[PDB]
Amino acid sequence: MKHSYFISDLHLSETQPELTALFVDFMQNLAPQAERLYILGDLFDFWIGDDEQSALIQQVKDLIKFVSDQGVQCYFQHGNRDFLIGERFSKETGAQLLPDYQLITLYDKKILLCHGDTLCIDDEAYQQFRRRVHQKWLQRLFLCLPLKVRVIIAEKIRAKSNQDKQAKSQEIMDVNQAFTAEKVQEFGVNLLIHGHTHREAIHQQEEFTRIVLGDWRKNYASILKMDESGEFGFIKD
């Protein structure tokens, strides 16, 4: 039974070693038997450049490389927490980098993949911040700074973002339905998979189905599985 997995929004961090354990069990016991593994952003709590080094980072890279070298096709799509991942991280892990939208053909299904933050177009404060940090010239500037200063910048940008979110309603921090519907029509799909919005769900709209990967918490790993029988669903337990 050929099958593939979809995960996102793990936000791996030394502060939370409960998820890393869940990630190790998934990568060592289920991922090797998969045909493809897609990681749709927010694998790390934050990413400040491909020269980051730590016991947790070298662990996570190893798990991806071990799954990849066994013939599993691994893909990474950027999230908002780790959009700085580049060509070096891709070579070290085997995970091929996908653009912010990617149409795939899997098990006779046309599927649109994105992280999910580009669909929250009513969060205008976030979208303006997203346009700035995605400019290549400023990213080259940021990566020229020493490793230690970028971490504090990241920890404080994280800190501000935690404040601004409590200033926002839940509506504008979720996906705009009309825009999301237009995306699906642009790519000609009946199936859309994304993360970012934290709320694991499967919405069976009339025109299409929208699968939402949830956050990983200490007691739950959100893992979507599709197989060649055309079924899909989240690995419970």
Ligand SMILES: CCCCCCCCCCC[C@@H](O)CC(=O)N[C@H]1[C@@H](OP(=O)(O)O)O[C@H](CO)[C@@H](O)[C@@H]1OC(=O)C[C@H](O)CCCCCCCCCCC
């Ligand atoms: C080239 C520069 C490199 C910088 C490297 C950055 C390294 C760290 C990046 C991770 C931070 C990331 O969490 C910020 C973010 O995206 N938050 C949005 C998101 O909230 P989450 O909890 O992360 O899901 O989802 C929420 C719902 O959609 C959304 O609301 C949040 O958006 C925010 O809260 C952002 C704040 O509203 C504004 C942020 C301003 C902070 C400083 C801006 C200065 C611009 C810096 C330019 C150099």
Ligand SMILES: [Mn+2]
């Ligand atoms: Mn996100």
Ligand SMILES: [Mn+2]
């Ligand atoms: Mn996230």
